[PDB]
PDB file of all heavy atoms in Angstrom:
ATOM      1  N   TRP D 123       2.590  23.735  -5.859  1.00 19.63           N
ATOM      2  CA  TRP D 123       2.969  25.016  -5.016  1.00 19.63           C
ATOM      3  C   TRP D 123       2.293  24.906  -3.705  1.00 19.63           C
ATOM      4  O   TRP D 123       1.044  24.816  -3.736  1.00 19.63           O
ATOM      5  CB  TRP D 123       2.596  26.302  -5.805  1.00 19.63           C
ATOM      6  CG  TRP D 123       3.514  27.434  -5.443  1.00 19.63           C
ATOM      7  CD1 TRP D 123       4.077  27.753  -4.347  1.00 19.63           C
ATOM      8  CD2 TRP D 123       3.827  28.577  -6.531  1.00 19.63           C
ATOM      9  NE1 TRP D 123       4.718  29.008  -4.479  1.00 19.63           N
ATOM     10  CE2 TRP D 123       4.463  29.427  -5.771  1.00 19.63           C
ATOM     11  CE3 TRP D 123       3.428  28.767  -7.861  1.00 19.63           C
ATOM     12  CZ2 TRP D 123       5.067  30.627  -6.338  1.00 19.63           C
ATOM     13  CZ3 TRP D 123       4.017  29.976  -8.479  1.00 19.63           C
ATOM     14  CH2 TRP D 123       4.722  30.745  -7.729  1.00 19.63           C
ATOM     15  N   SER D 124       3.033  24.820  -2.573  1.00 16.69           N
ATOM     16  CA  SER D 124       2.544  24.829  -1.239  1.00 16.69           C
ATOM     17  C   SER D 124       2.693  26.081  -0.594  1.00 16.69           C
ATOM     18  O   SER D 124       3.743  26.755  -0.775  1.00 16.69           O
ATOM     19  CB  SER D 124       3.106  23.650  -0.527  1.00 16.69           C
ATOM     20  OG  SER D 124       3.386  22.374  -1.316  1.00 16.69           O
ATOM     21  N   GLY D 125       1.773  26.315   0.416  1.00 17.85           N
ATOM     22  CA  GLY D 125       2.026  27.481   1.271  1.00 17.85           C
ATOM     23  C   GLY D 125       1.529  27.178   2.661  1.00 17.85           C
ATOM     24  O   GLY D 125       0.482  26.466   2.723  1.00 17.85           O
ATOM     25  N   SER D 126       2.218  27.617   3.731  1.00 20.75           N
ATOM     26  CA  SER D 126       1.766  27.304   4.940  1.00 20.75           C
ATOM     27  C   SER D 126       2.182  28.407   5.941  1.00 20.75           C
ATOM     28  O   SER D 126       3.260  29.112   5.585  1.00 20.75           O
ATOM     29  CB  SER D 126       2.292  25.900   5.514  1.00 20.75           C
ATOM     30  OG  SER D 126       3.712  26.058   5.552  1.00 20.75           O
ATOM     31  N   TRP D 127       1.355  28.732   6.914  1.00 22.17           N
ATOM     32  CA  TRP D 127       1.586  29.822   7.826  1.00 22.17           C
ATOM     33  C   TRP D 127       0.786  29.657   9.113  1.00 22.17           C
ATOM     34  O   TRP D 127       0.088  28.682   9.241  1.00 22.17           O
ATOM     35  CB  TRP D 127       1.165  31.199   7.074  1.00 22.17           C
ATOM     36  CG  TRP D 127      -0.305  31.214   6.820  1.00 22.17           C
ATOM     37  CD1 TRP D 127      -1.275  31.811   7.496  1.00 22.17           C
ATOM     38  CD2 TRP D 127      -0.934  30.710   5.709  1.00 22.17           C
ATOM     39  NE1 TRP D 127      -2.510  31.687   6.947  1.00 22.17           N
ATOM     40  CE2 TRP D 127      -2.283  31.117   5.705  1.00 22.17           C
ATOM     41  CE3 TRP D 127      -0.553  29.951   4.562  1.00 22.17           C
ATOM     42  CZ2 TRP D 127      -3.266  30.711   4.694  1.00 22.17           C
ATOM     43  CZ3 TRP D 127      -1.493  29.682   3.570  1.00 22.17           C
ATOM     44  CH2 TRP D 127      -2.760  30.059   3.601  1.00 22.17           C
ATOM     45  N   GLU D 128       1.005  30.506  10.155  1.00 22.00           N
ATOM     46  CA  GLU D 128       0.417  30.534  11.333  1.00 22.00           C
ATOM     47  C   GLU D 128      -0.449  31.634  11.463  1.00 22.00           C
ATOM     48  O   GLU D 128      -0.108  32.808  10.900  1.00 22.00           O
ATOM     49  CB  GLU D 128       1.343  30.500  12.629  1.00 22.00           C
ATOM     50  CG  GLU D 128       2.511  29.418  12.519  1.00 22.00           C
ATOM     51  CD  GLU D 128       1.806  28.052  12.929  1.00 22.00           C
ATOM     52  OE1 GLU D 128       0.815  27.977  13.667  1.00 22.00           O
ATOM     53  OE2 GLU D 128       2.401  26.998  12.516  1.00 22.00           O
ATOM     54  N   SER D 129      -1.665  31.586  12.028  1.00 23.17           N
ATOM     55  CA  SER D 129      -2.672  32.696  12.141  1.00 23.17           C
ATOM     56  C   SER D 129      -3.716  32.243  13.019  1.00 23.17           C
ATOM     57  O   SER D 129      -4.058  31.118  13.313  1.00 23.17           O
ATOM     58  CB  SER D 129      -3.274  32.806  10.647  1.00 23.17           C
ATOM     59  OG  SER D 129      -4.234  33.861  10.636  1.00 23.17           O
ATOM     60  N   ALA D 130      -4.429  33.261  13.487  1.00 23.83           N
ATOM     61  CA  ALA D 130      -5.595  33.175  14.360  1.00 23.83           C
ATOM     62  C   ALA D 130      -6.797  32.795  13.562  1.00 23.83           C
ATOM     63  O   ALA D 130      -7.736  32.243  13.949  1.00 23.83           O
ATOM     64  CB  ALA D 130      -5.821  34.387  15.225  1.00 23.83           C
ATOM     65  N   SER D 131      -6.737  33.034  12.243  1.00 24.03           N
ATOM     66  CA  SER D 131      -7.773  32.644  11.324  1.00 24.03           C
ATOM     67  C   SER D 131      -7.374  31.939  10.074  1.00 24.03           C
ATOM     68  O   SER D 131      -6.188  31.848   9.733  1.00 24.03           O
ATOM     69  CB  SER D 131      -8.669  33.869  11.007  1.00 24.03           C
ATOM     70  OG  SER D 131      -8.005  34.707   9.984  1.00 24.03           O
ATOM     71  N   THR D 132      -8.479  31.544   9.383  1.00 23.32           N
ATOM     72  CA  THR D 132      -8.206  30.883   8.059  1.00 23.32           C
ATOM     73  C   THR D 132      -8.575  31.899   6.839  1.00 23.32           C
ATOM     74  O   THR D 132      -8.556  31.406   5.735  1.00 23.32           O
ATOM     75  CB  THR D 132      -9.060  29.614   7.809  1.00 23.32           C
ATOM     76  OG1 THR D 132     -10.353  30.046   7.840  1.00 23.32           O
ATOM     77  CG2 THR D 132      -8.761  28.594   8.950  1.00 23.32           C
ATOM     78  N   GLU D 133      -8.654  33.207   7.218  1.00 21.74           N
ATOM     79  CA  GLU D 133      -9.074  34.068   6.246  1.00 21.74           C
ATOM     80  C   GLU D 133      -8.166  34.199   4.994  1.00 21.74           C
ATOM     81  O   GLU D 133      -8.682  34.445   3.868  1.00 21.74           O
ATOM     82  CB  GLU D 133      -9.095  35.517   6.973  1.00 21.74           C
ATOM     83  CG  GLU D 133      -9.521  36.634   6.022  1.00 21.74           C
ATOM     84  CD  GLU D 133      -9.487  37.984   6.721  1.00 21.74           C
ATOM     85  OE1 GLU D 133      -9.109  38.156   7.851  1.00 21.74           O
ATOM     86  OE2 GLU D 133      -9.624  39.029   5.885  1.00 21.74           O
ATOM     87  N   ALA D 134      -6.863  33.870   5.144  1.00 24.12           N
ATOM     88  CA  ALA D 134      -6.054  33.948   4.002  1.00 24.12           C
ATOM     89  C   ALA D 134      -6.036  32.725   3.104  1.00 24.12           C
ATOM     90  O   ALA D 134      -5.417  32.742   2.121  1.00 24.12           O
ATOM     91  CB  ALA D 134      -4.542  34.117   4.606  1.00 24.12           C
ATOM     92  N   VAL D 135      -6.765  31.724   3.467  1.00 27.92           N
ATOM     93  CA  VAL D 135      -6.782  30.375   2.641  1.00 27.92           C
ATOM     94  C   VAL D 135      -7.310  30.660   1.350  1.00 27.92           C
ATOM     95  O   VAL D 135      -6.644  30.379   0.284  1.00 27.92           O
ATOM     96  CB  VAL D 135      -7.611  29.296   3.402  1.00 27.92           C
ATOM     97  CG1 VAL D 135      -7.868  28.191   2.411  1.00 27.92           C
ATOM     98  CG2 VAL D 135      -6.651  28.807   4.561  1.00 27.92           C
ATOM     99  N   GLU D 136      -8.571  31.232   1.262  1.00 29.95           N
ATOM    100  CA  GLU D 136      -9.230  31.407  -0.043  1.00 29.95           C
ATOM    101  C   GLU D 136      -8.173  32.388  -0.863  1.00 29.95           C
ATOM    102  O   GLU D 136      -8.021  32.192  -2.064  1.00 29.95           O
ATOM    103  CB  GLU D 136     -10.595  32.046   0.096  1.00 29.95           C
ATOM    104  CG  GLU D 136     -11.082  32.660  -1.298  1.00 29.95           C
ATOM    105  CD  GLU D 136     -12.544  33.022  -1.140  1.00 29.95           C
ATOM    106  OE1 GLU D 136     -12.941  33.682  -0.285  1.00 29.95           O
ATOM    107  OE2 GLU D 136     -13.240  32.604  -2.204  1.00 29.95           O
ATOM    108  N   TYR D 137      -7.777  33.442  -0.254  1.00 29.70           N
ATOM    109  CA  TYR D 137      -6.942  34.448  -0.920  1.00 29.70           C
ATOM    110  C   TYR D 137      -5.683  33.905  -1.556  1.00 29.70           C
ATOM    111  O   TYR D 137      -5.338  34.256  -2.718  1.00 29.70           O
ATOM    112  CB  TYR D 137      -6.528  35.572   0.128  1.00 29.70           C
ATOM    113  CG  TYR D 137      -5.637  36.652  -0.653  1.00 29.70           C
ATOM    114  CD1 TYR D 137      -6.258  37.839  -1.238  1.00 29.70           C
ATOM    115  CD2 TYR D 137      -4.273  36.550  -0.479  1.00 29.70           C
ATOM    116  CE1 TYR D 137      -5.321  38.704  -1.768  1.00 29.70           C
ATOM    117  CE2 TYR D 137      -3.404  37.458  -1.156  1.00 29.70           C
ATOM    118  CZ  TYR D 137      -4.011  38.626  -1.694  1.00 29.70           C
ATOM    119  OH  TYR D 137      -3.198  39.538  -2.331  1.00 29.70           O
ATOM    120  N   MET D 138      -4.959  32.952  -0.872  1.00 31.37           N
ATOM    121  CA  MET D 138      -3.720  32.433  -1.430  1.00 31.37           C
ATOM    122  C   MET D 138      -3.973  31.388  -2.499  1.00 31.37           C
ATOM    123  O   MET D 138      -3.324  31.236  -3.430  1.00 31.37           O
ATOM    124  CB  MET D 138      -2.838  31.887  -0.371  1.00 31.37           C
ATOM    125  CG  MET D 138      -2.214  32.981   0.624  1.00 31.37           C
ATOM    126  SD  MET D 138      -1.227  34.403  -0.523  1.00 31.37           S
ATOM    127  CE  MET D 138       0.179  33.261  -1.285  1.00 31.37           C
ATOM    128  N   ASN D 139      -5.157  30.573  -2.229  1.00 35.41           N
ATOM    129  CA  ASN D 139      -5.606  29.749  -3.389  1.00 35.41           C
ATOM    130  C   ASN D 139      -5.784  30.454  -4.636  1.00 35.41           C
ATOM    131  O   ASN D 139      -5.390  29.926  -5.734  1.00 35.41           O
ATOM    132  CB  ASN D 139      -6.860  28.931  -2.969  1.00 35.41           C
ATOM    133  CG  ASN D 139      -6.633  27.630  -2.132  1.00 35.41           C
ATOM    134  OD1 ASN D 139      -5.580  26.990  -2.203  1.00 35.41           O
ATOM    135  ND2 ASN D 139      -7.601  27.353  -1.300  1.00 35.41           N
ATOM    136  N   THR D 140      -6.319  31.615  -4.592  1.00 38.27           N
ATOM    137  CA  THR D 140      -6.688  32.484  -5.672  1.00 38.27           C
ATOM    138  C   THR D 140      -5.314  32.955  -6.281  1.00 38.27           C
ATOM    139  O   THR D 140      -5.139  32.889  -7.553  1.00 38.27           O
ATOM    140  CB  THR D 140      -7.467  33.668  -5.317  1.00 38.27           C
ATOM    141  OG1 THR D 140      -8.853  33.160  -5.121  1.00 38.27           O
ATOM    142  CG2 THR D 140      -7.443  34.660  -6.425  1.00 38.27           C
ATOM    143  N   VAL D 141      -4.457  33.400  -5.472  1.00 37.99           N
ATOM    144  CA  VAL D 141      -3.036  33.754  -5.943  1.00 37.99           C
ATOM    145  C   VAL D 141      -2.394  32.690  -6.673  1.00 37.99           C
ATOM    146  O   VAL D 141      -1.988  32.839  -7.710  1.00 37.99           O
ATOM    147  CB  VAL D 141      -2.248  34.379  -4.846  1.00 37.99           C
ATOM    148  CG1 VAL D 141      -0.715  34.451  -5.155  1.00 37.99           C
ATOM    149  CG2 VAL D 141      -2.699  35.845  -4.396  1.00 37.99           C
ATOM    150  N   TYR D 142      -2.106  31.565  -5.894  1.00 42.06           N
ATOM    151  CA  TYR D 142      -1.359  30.440  -6.495  1.00 42.06           C
ATOM    152  C   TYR D 142      -2.092  29.905  -7.849  1.00 42.06           C
ATOM    153  O   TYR D 142      -1.259  29.544  -8.826  1.00 42.06           O
ATOM    154  CB  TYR D 142      -1.232  29.322  -5.462  1.00 42.06           C
ATOM    155  CG  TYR D 142      -0.187  29.705  -4.549  1.00 42.06           C
ATOM    156  CD1 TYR D 142      -0.218  29.511  -3.151  1.00 42.06           C
ATOM    157  CD2 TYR D 142       1.003  30.411  -4.891  1.00 42.06           C
ATOM    158  CE1 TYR D 142       0.775  29.860  -2.294  1.00 42.06           C
ATOM    159  CE2 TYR D 142       2.022  30.850  -3.953  1.00 42.06           C
ATOM    160  CZ  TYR D 142       1.848  30.540  -2.734  1.00 42.06           C
ATOM    161  OH  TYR D 142       2.867  30.869  -1.642  1.00 42.06           O
ATOM    162  N   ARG D 143      -3.422  29.858  -7.850  1.00 40.83           N
ATOM    163  CA  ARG D 143      -4.062  29.352  -9.024  1.00 40.83           C
ATOM    164  C   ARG D 143      -3.766  30.280 -10.273  1.00 40.83           C
ATOM    165  O   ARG D 143      -3.581  29.751 -11.388  1.00 40.83           O
ATOM    166  CB  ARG D 143      -5.508  29.167  -8.855  1.00 40.83           C
ATOM    167  CG  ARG D 143      -5.860  27.877  -7.901  1.00 40.83           C
ATOM    168  CD  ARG D 143      -7.181  27.987  -7.279  1.00 40.83           C
ATOM    169  NE  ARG D 143      -7.232  26.884  -6.306  1.00 40.83           N
ATOM    170  CZ  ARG D 143      -8.456  26.688  -5.506  1.00 40.83           C
ATOM    171  NH1 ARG D 143      -9.266  27.607  -5.560  1.00 40.83           N
ATOM    172  NH2 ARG D 143      -8.363  25.685  -4.735  1.00 40.83           N
TER     173      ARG D 143
END
Side-chain angles (χ1 to χ4, degrees):
Chain D
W123 211 325
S124 316
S126 62
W127 62 97
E128 305 284 338
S129 178
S131 79
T132 64
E133 182 184 354
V135 162
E136 170 168 45
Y137 177 92
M138 293 305 299
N139 276 332
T140 288
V141 162
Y142 287 139
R143 286 160 188 175

